[PDB]
Every structure is written in structure tokens, then in C-alpha cells.
Amino acid sequence: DLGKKLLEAARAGQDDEVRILMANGADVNAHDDQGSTPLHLAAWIGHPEIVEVLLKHGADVNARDTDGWTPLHLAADNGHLEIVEVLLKYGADVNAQDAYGLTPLHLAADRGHLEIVEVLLKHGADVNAQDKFGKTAFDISIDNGNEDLAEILQ
């Protein structure tokens, strides 16, 4: 199973292994037991070129893991600016909800990743989205004491 070797390769951050496995037919849409695909893993660790070649070869941009996380949630949560752009370009769902209703905007806001917030917003992110607690990005800027965040949010 090349599927199983591609995930690790992707989680490792090796560009060449990824290519070789893909050239030999590795399933770009393989998943681990927790539903992470090679695209999730590359987007979480922050490997822009790997995120690109998987998308280029049919990776499901909007695959959900068992917590309802997409590659875009991961990128947003981990501060990976270029990766967010790449995902959006390839049709990532800017308003994807996890199990708790958090969107990529909630995650970037809570992490204080201002450039990502701006990119999400420019791509139609919903600033009024509420998670299952009731919080919007705005409430996050108040709760976290992020005055710079609350600056762009109005």
C-alpha cells in the first residue's frame, strides 16, 4: 500500500519521496485512521510545494478528518499563509465548519494570524459565523484581548 507510505512522506515533509510515491501510483486521497489525508498533513506541517503537487494531482481540497477539519482549517490554525492562498485557489471552502462549528476564520483569529484573517475575509469568509458556543471572530478578539484583531474586524 503506497497510500500508507505517502501519508508519512507527506507528514515528514519530504518533497522527493512524495513525488516518487505519486509517480508510482500512491493514492493522493488515502487516509489514516483519524481521516488525515496527505493534503491535511502537508498543510498542517507547512510544506507549500507538497500542498501544490497533491492538489495538482487531484487531492480533495475539502477532505474532512474525523473532527471535521479540512486542510484549510489546519493551515489557518498553524499560520501557514502561502498554503491558505494555495488552498483557496484550488477551491477550498472558506467557511468550512468543524464538529464544533469553528471555521478557518475562528482559528486564524484565535491564533492572532492577522494576514491569514485578511486573506480569508477577502475570499468571502463569514465574519458573523458562530461556533457551537456562540462565538464569532469578533468575540474571540475581545476574549483574547487582541486589539489589533478587533481593528481589522470593523
Add this chain to the structure above:
Amino acid sequence: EMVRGQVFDVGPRYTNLSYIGEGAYGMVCSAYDNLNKVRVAIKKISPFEHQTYCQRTLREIKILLRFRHENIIGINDIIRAPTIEQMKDVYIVQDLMETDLYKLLKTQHLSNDHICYFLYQILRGLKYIHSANVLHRDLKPSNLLLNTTCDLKICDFGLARVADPDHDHTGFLTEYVATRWYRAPEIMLNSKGYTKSIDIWSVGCILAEMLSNRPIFPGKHYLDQLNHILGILGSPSQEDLNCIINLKARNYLLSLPHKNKVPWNRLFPNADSKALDLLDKMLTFNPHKRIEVEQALAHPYLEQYYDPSDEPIAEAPFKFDMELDDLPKEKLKELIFEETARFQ
């Protein structure tokens, strides 16, 4: 003297530089201290462009210079420009510690003896911090530094605060990128005035992780953190709910389906039964019901180490919140300049 294109000007006392890490607060090099004949760690900070950097830097300098305890990282020296206008940068010199509990845990499952001894050292350090009227607020394995002989020193007081009973009740945790897995459930709920008890929760999370070698509440966000926590502790009792002041926090917990408590021996079937009894007292949902640092040291799990006469307290506790939040970054520039004067 230039390292990765940055000036790193550590005078004739510190030579033989090597870069060993960098980020949002601190380019770090190792260097040879030519006075003490040992290699040391030198954190270069330049924080004057942002009020948040200055608060954090002043606190940390103030707190580390007041503390002197074997289980707390000290500041051995400070280098800065001889006049306020010149100071673009501050260099803080500390002991060079070869590793940390985060790296250790990923290389091996600790024996019971090592666990006990590390938990002893963590609490002995914590005893002194709490006796100084300080809350660390960011205890986690990577803030537990280790040398090659199992000596542990809790460092990183950038998010520490004096416990002020009343008045400006703290007070957000504004280092938004790092783990939240060790944060007490009242911080996740955005509680009002939390206490020393938040640090005892973090220590209980570290204990649990030393017992099984994996984090006990690894939430992906605040709501997934709560779910992890409630999944093991069970639904809080009405008594514990009733203690929650924040209404929409209490209302949110009331909204959730009932979860039963998972017995600690089911999660940790090979752990020492006394470490589990102690763990139970640390990881109590209700902050008021959690064990305190002195009672934890005197718990039977730690009997082989517990020695009150060799567990020092602070000779000069901090009295009140340092009044920093409203103060502008030029003013904070002045006190940082003064705090650092004892070194030249």
C-alpha cells in the same frame, strides 16, 4: 560580530558564538562565558516597537531577577546599551540547559522513579513561585528545562502575573501560537479572577503525560479542549457549575450531554496508585477544590523526597500587579532600562 545577518554584540566576556534558535521574542545563541569558563545561553531581545513586547520583557526580567531557587532558571548577566536612546536591544544570559521535558518525553517512557523525582522538582520550584505571589500561567513540558543529570528548572515567565486578589483581575494569555493543552478549564471558559490553582492544573497535565507518554487533553481548540477534559473528568456537578460566575460559560456546560468520569486506573492501568491519587487531586474541575502546592509536596507519592526544611520560600514576595497594561511602550522602555542596571 554577525550571526544569521543580525548583530549579536556580547562584548569581550562572551565569545565563540553559535546560533541555536530564534523567533517572536529572542534570537538565542550559545556562547563561552570567559569569566565562569562555561558555555551559556544568550537571548537577544529587541521589544521596544510594541507595548505587548515591553510588558512581557519587563515582567520577565523583574521576576527572574527577584527569584533565586535551584528549580528556576536564573538570569546570570544582562548586556545592554549604556544609555536609553542607544538601547535597541537587551541580552539576557542564562544557564545553558541541554534539553527539556518535551524532548525527553518524545525519546523515552520515563520510569516511575524519574517521574517522581521530576514531579518533586516541578512542585519544589512551584512552591517557591507561589510563595512569591506569582502565577506562572504557562507551565508545560517545554518550559521544564533539564541538564544531563536530571536537574529540572522551570523557565519562561513571559506570561506570569502577580496574584492580585482584587482590582484589575487578570488578564489574558496573549502568546496565541503555543500549546493550550496545559491550560486550566477556567481559562478556556474565560473566567474572571483565576488563582494559583491554574498552575496546579498544568502540573497535573504534565504528570499525566509523564505517566503515559502522551498529552492527556490534546484539544484542537478551546471547545475541543473542554470536550477532552469533560470526557475524562465527567460532567461537572451542579455544585461545581454553580461556582462558575460567567453565565454563558455555565449555560454552555449545562447545554452538553452527560459524560461520566473515567477512573484514572482505567486510563493509567500501570501507573503508581499514589501518583494517580495525587493526579486526581490536581486535575479537579473546580479550582477551589484543587490541591495546593504545599499539600501536593506532602502527598504520599512524594514521601521519599518531601523535606520542608530543604524547600525554600521567597524572601521578598511581589505585592501587587505591576501596573503595566495602561503604561505606554516609551515608559516601559525606562523601567526595563532601570531593572537592568545592577549588571552595568
